[PDB]
Each structure stands twice: as C-alpha cells, then as structure tokens.
Amino acid sequence: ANRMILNETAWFGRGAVGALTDEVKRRGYQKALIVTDKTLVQCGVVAKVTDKMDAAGLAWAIYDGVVPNPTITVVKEGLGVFQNSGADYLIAIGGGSPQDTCKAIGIISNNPEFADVRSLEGLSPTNKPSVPILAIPTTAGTAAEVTIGYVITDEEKRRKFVCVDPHDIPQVAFIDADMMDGMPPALKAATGVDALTHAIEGYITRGAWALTDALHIKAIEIIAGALRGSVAGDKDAGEEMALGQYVAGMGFSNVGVGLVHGMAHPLGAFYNTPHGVANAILLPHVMRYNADFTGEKYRDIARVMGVKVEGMGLEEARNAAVEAVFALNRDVGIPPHLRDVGVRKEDIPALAQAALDDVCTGGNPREATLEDIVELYHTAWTS
Amino acid sequence: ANRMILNETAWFGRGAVGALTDEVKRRGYQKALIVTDKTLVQCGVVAKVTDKMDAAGLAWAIYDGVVPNPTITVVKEGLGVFQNSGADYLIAIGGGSPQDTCKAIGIISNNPEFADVRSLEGLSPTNKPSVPILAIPTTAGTAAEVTIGYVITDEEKRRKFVCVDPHDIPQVAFIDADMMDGMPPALKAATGVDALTHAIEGYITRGAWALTDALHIKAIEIIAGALRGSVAGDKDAGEEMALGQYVAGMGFSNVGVGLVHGMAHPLGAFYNTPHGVANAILLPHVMRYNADFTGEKYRDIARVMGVKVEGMGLEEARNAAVEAVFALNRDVGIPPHLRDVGVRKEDIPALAQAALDDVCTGGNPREATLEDIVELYHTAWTS
Ligand SMILES: NC(=O)C1=CN([C@@H]2O[C@H](COP(=O)(O)OP(=O)(O)OC[C@H]3O[C@@H](n4cnc5c(N)ncnc54)[C@H](O)[C@@H]3O)[C@@H](O)[C@H]2O)C=CC1
Ligand SMILES: NC(=O)C1=CN([C@@H]2O[C@H](COP(=O)(O)OP(=O)(O)OC[C@H]3O[C@@H](n4cnc5c(N)ncnc54)[C@H](O)[C@@H]3O)[C@@H](O)[C@H]2O)C=CC1
Ligand SMILES: [Fe+3]
Ligand SMILES: [Fe+3]
C-alpha cells in the first residue's frame, strides 16, 4: 500500500496570507514564534504577515537567525528562542532553510530527547506531533510547506542529513505569490529548476505510482510553462510557479526523488552551494544517465515542456526532454558547469562517495555505482 | 484565494487497512467505536478490520444501525452508543451513509450544543474538532473519507440537509479495494457513476480552479477506464475505481458540484432512492443542459472517456461526452428513467423547488430556474 501525507489545510493564490489570522483564531493559538531570516525581515516580507497579525491582536515573537543550508547550530539557537518565547505554535516564513529549521524546532520542542539534532536523522522515532506549524513559502520553491522531509547541515561532519517524520507536517500552508515577487530573477530561476527537479525526479522515482505520476506531470507542465515569464517578472507566471512548486511537493514528499538531490547535497555541505543551482546544473546530466530506465515518461516530459513529440521515436523524445532542460537552464541564466559555482575537481571522489551514501539516491530509477557518480560530476564540471 | 481541505494521512491500494493498527498505536488512542451497517457486519467486511485490531490488542465497540440516507434518528442512536462506550476515536466502515453518520457523531460528541442534529446544517459554527475519525470506504464511491460535507435526512421535514465543517475531516483514510470487492455489480455501477458525477460536476463547477481541474480530469479518466471492468468483477479495475473515486473527492469537496447532486437529494428525501442511481440517471441530462457554460471541458471529458476527438469540433465533442455517459449508464445496467426507480410525476413541482433550494445547486455553471429543473426531471422521468 502507498501512503500520502498532505497538508490538512492549504490556502492558494495572491492574498492567501490574508487567511492566517482567522486560521489562528479558529485554532485558539495564543502566541507564534515566526522562524525566518534577516533578508525577509529586511525586505519587508515578514511584515506582510506581522502587520496583519498586529491588526488582529495576535501575539508573535521572531527568530531571524536561519542561514541558507541551516546548520545544527541554527536549529539549537531557534530551539532556545522557542522554549523561552512561550509560543504555542510556529509560523515558517521563508524558503527551504527557515521551513526545515521550523520543522526541526517544532519536533524537538515536543520531543525534547532529540535536542542534539543528529538523532532526528532518518525515520525519526518521535512519539509526539510537532508543535503546530503554519508554513508560508517565499521561494518557488522547495515545497517544504507540504513535505515530511527536512535537511540539516552537520558542519563538523561536512554532510547534509535528511529527517523524515509525518509528525513534522505543517497544519496549514499559505501559498501566496505576493510573498515571492521580491525574489531576484536568479533566485526565481534557481528555485524554479529546483521545483522542476523535484517534479522530474518524482515522476521517474522507483516508488512512483498513479497519483504521484498525475501530480508530478501536472507540476512539470505548470513549471515549464511559467518559469521563463516569472524570471522576466510576469505576475500571473509568478502565481503559476507558486502552485507548480507545491503540486511537485504533494508527489515527491510521498515517493522520493533520485540522484540529482543525492549529488546536490554534498555540494551544499562542502561549499554551501544553493540547493536549486546545484540541482539545475546536475538535472539534465542525470536525466541523460537515467533515460533508459524511464519507460515512455521522457516523452510526457518533452510534450508538457512544449517539444513537438508527434512521430519522433522514443530515443529522440528522451533527448528532446534533456535538451528542453538545457535550453530552460540557459534561458533563465543558470550557469552551465559546476566549476562556475565554486566546485573543485579534487573533491569529486569524496563528493561521489557522499552522493552514493545519500538516502535520496535510493529513489534513482537506475542503480548508481561510485564510478558512475564520479563520471557524472566530471560531466557537469566543465566543457 | 482558494482553500483545500484534504486527509493529512491516506493509505491507497489492496491491503491498505493493513496500516490501521500501526496508525492507532502511533496516535495513542485507547478504544474505537466502529460505525457501520448490518450488511457489512453480515458479509464479514467489518471483520477484515476487527480481526487485525484484535491481533494488535486494540479495544473496539460497534454501532451497526446506519441505514442508507442516514436519518436524524440514526445519528442520535450512534451518538448514544459513542457517549456510553468510552471510545476516544471513531472508525467509519462503509459507504457514504456510515461515513456521514460517523462525521455527525464525531462533531456532536465534541460540540454538545449541536446534538439536536438539525443545527449542524450549512457552515456549522463548531468550536472544536470532531472526535478523530479513521475512514475506511466500502463503496467506490462517495469519497466521504476526504470530504468536509455530510448529508443527513430530516424525516419529519422530508429533506436531505448538507453540513460543511473542516472540523469533520478524517485524520486517516484507508482506500482498500479488498473492502469493496463484495459490492454487488449494481452497487459498483451506482457508486461508480456517483464518483463519475462528482468528478464531472467538480470539473465544471463555478468555483473550479487549476488544482481541482487537474484532480477532476484525472479522476474522470480513471473512472471511465475502470468502471465497466470493475462491474464485470476485474480485480485491478476494482483498485483503479477505489483511487478514482477518492481523487474526485479531493477536488469536489473543496470547490463544489452542481445541479445533479442538487436534484438527486430531493429523490433521497422523498423516496429513499440510492444517491448514486439518482445521480447516474440525472447526470447526462444535466450535462446536456450545462454544455454551453463549460468552455472546452466536455472535449477533455470525451477524450478521457475514449471518444476519438482528433479532428472533431467542440459542438460534436460536447454531444459525444453526453453520449459516452448515456452509453456507460446502459453498459453497467443503471435504469434509464426516474419512473423505473419509484419517482412520481405528481411530486416533480415539489422536488424542483427542493432542488432549487439545495446548496449544491449554487455550483452549477448555468443558473437554474424552477421551470428549468421542472423540465429536467420531466426529461429524466420516462420515454
Ligand atoms: N524540506 C524539504 O523537503 C526540502 C528541503 N530543501 C532544502 O531547502 C533549502 C533551500 O531553500 P530555498 O528556498 O531554495 O532557499 P533558502 O531558504 O536557502 O533561501 C535562499 C536565500 O534567498 C533569500 N530569499 C528567500 N526568499 C526570498 C524572497 N522572497 N525575496 C528575497 N530574498 C529571498 C533568503 O533570505 C536566503 O538568503 C536547502 O537547505 C535544501 O536542502 C529542498 C527541497 C526539499
Ligand atoms: N459525504 C459526502 O460528501 C457525500 C455524501 N453522500 C451520501 O452518501 C450516501 C450514499 O452512500 P453510498 O456509499 O452510495 O451507499 P450507502 O453507504 O448508503 O450504502 C448502500 C448500501 O450498500 C451496502 N454496501 C456498502 N458497501 C458494501 C459492500 N462492500 N458490500 C456489500 N454491500 C455493501 C450498504 O450496506 C447499504 O445497504 C447518501 O446518503 C449521500 O447523501 C454522497 C456523496 C458525497
Ligand atoms: Fe530540492
Ligand atoms: Fe455524491
């Protein structure tokens, strides 16, 4: 049997954070800890929420110490703030980094034996649900608001580790493009191809089944249709991306991804490479590696990405899907090589071992060896 | 902004009730009231759940007094059992009737100011969540396990009233075709076209948007592909129908349906007509009435119902969709006229007024007058 964890309550569309004060009142919560970063405070994005909260007379404190690729230290700092704040719920405002941080705080806060943070890794044997989380994405996106995974950086060990826990699922997600319009184009592009990577790896993952297939192929269609326009600054394209990134989550959270996420995590841990950029560069190279274990599914990808696949045989359609992703990466200004974003040749053997041992690699529809991952990094390295 | 209420946790596939004992233990519940009917006790379908529960050492009581089109009297009997049982949670085993009954008991049981049952009608202003509900459908189906609506019969007033409450959403749904194989073919057919009706009315409802559209058109595809085979007794067709009926719910619960449900509720209340059979007879007639306010959407329906649309104008495609539903109704043995299932000509004026006042009618993409609903019943009535 296949399990689906989803958000019990989700609000979709420009103005969706408009619903938050009434959700909080109907739930009887008394005080929020908002988990976010200095940038979203600075740019006035957190204020879009706190202004409404203040107008409704709802108490909030704020932790803004989250850094991209959130570390064990960030989780413990935020945990310390929550525990002294008196908060009875959490509001995650940000991308993956604040949202994963918020999941770790919420879990540890109702399961205090996990406050070392490392022991949460894998299928966390938590007894209690997370402190309730209201999740507000500001990137488009990691789909953190609807996934049961969160990823934390162990600095001492130089590795991103995955915590998977149904207890961490947010009680409400607010998917509101107003909260996303301030993303620089490069951030829209990087988080866009992240979303696309989720949808494409979810579509072809070992555990894929009819429902996740339907969700994933619709998310690829929405993302491929909207990203160029969103990066260009189109309003409706921004709103489409907010939805597409989410729908991808509904799928990949429940069945997994593959070697792209597997190979992107070591780059995060070694170099602090943004997750989306690492995914964007690796995606077409890994799709080429996977092509022969994906049945007719690349034909579907090619079609929804606007390639005329009528008549074109399966081998040509598989290549047109890989090329449509190369073309998207170029069109939205993602650098094409790992060397352009600070990766070192010398590190590839160690990166490849960490990629092979990454839990996300298990979902890849083609069995990867150390030497295959070594070769793949070398292919993404430089011309 | 658009809201989605879904199941936080759902298990899909043959053997899905296999997960119930683990879900109960993880949740720390002490004692279930199972809400069901004498038929599912008699046919040994309840035992498929209680045998696993007994093997896991889990306490259960049982209320088996639910009748099709569950009355106020059934809700109060079940309420009385729950309140004296000591149960801390509910397991709904059945079709719409036990599942809607279980939602009413769960709500009333944590919201004692609604125990008259009539006051729950509409957007019930409940303060408290329902007693937690684990939902196990045995028909394919009403999608009750995932909807926020429930429908109760006021015998004295001769009317089905709709209660809409996010507090009633089941904590976990187990969608397990093993629990559905015992349905007589006529019940598979009647609940099948119910599922199809939900998906088609959801697809064209006034509140329809991108997410519900994707869910609905995928559910029409699954249902139209599997129903004939399921009615014939095909195993995999049965499993497909279990999924399709659910996916339809994920949509229509969150945006609504239309005039088919609106006109079927009076038949329930006047005659105790099965819901699905009334939906099946009315569906193609209402679809023809709606055709011109459905954009390109009947062309989508025609395609996924296996009509060759390659070089077909939208007018012809709209008619082929109406005809594909007539053809399905014939092939699965649904009587074609309202007169064949015990409706009276003399009642049509009163039925039409009750249909017009039914809250479900509001979603219809074409504004219905009394005269239009009168005419529609007359069209479905006889040769
Ligand atoms: N929880 C899960 O299931 C998943 C986890 N992840 C994790 O998510 C993280 C990546 O999160 P992302 O959203 O890609 O970025 P992020 O949350 O790391 O943020 C990147 C940077 O963009 C800035 N930023 C974010 N939103 C902005 C906005 N609206 N306007 C202006 N600046 C803004 C932030 O302040 C930050 O400096 C990684 O740690 C990755 O491992 C990725 C996918 C799935
Ligand atoms: N909750 C919601 O949002 C919705 C509500 N409904 C409600 O659902 C009700 C109709 O529910 P249905 O599921 O169509 O039927 P039902 O639950 O009323 O049952 C119909 C008959 O079939 C029998 N049966 C059910 N499963 C069986 C199985 N596996 N094997 C043998 N016999 C079986 C039952 O014992 C019963 O006698 C109506 O009262 C309607 O208003 C309908 C759809 C949506
Ligand atoms: Fe990702
Ligand atoms: Fe129905």
Author numbering:
A (entry chain BBB), B (entry chain AAA): 3 to 385
Sentences from the paper on this structure:
This enzyme, referred to as FucO, is also known as an Fe2+, NAD+-dependent group-III alcohol de­hydrogenase and is involved in the catabolism of rare sugars in E. coli.
The isolated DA1472 variant is a double point mutation variant, N151G and L259V. The mode of binding of NADH in the active site, including the nicotinamide moiety, is well defined by the electron density map, being the same in both structures. The structures of the protein regions with the mutated residues are well defined by the electron density maps and the conformations of these regions are the same as in the wild-type. The results illustrate a dramatic shift in substrate scope. The preference of the wild-type enzyme for short-chain aliphatic 2-hy­droxy­aldehydes has been shifted to favor aryl-substituted, non-hydroxy­lated aldehydes. k cat/K M for phenyl­acetaldehyde (compound 3) has increased approximately 9000-fold whereas the activity with the native (S)-lactaldehyde (compound 2) has decreased approximately 80-fold.
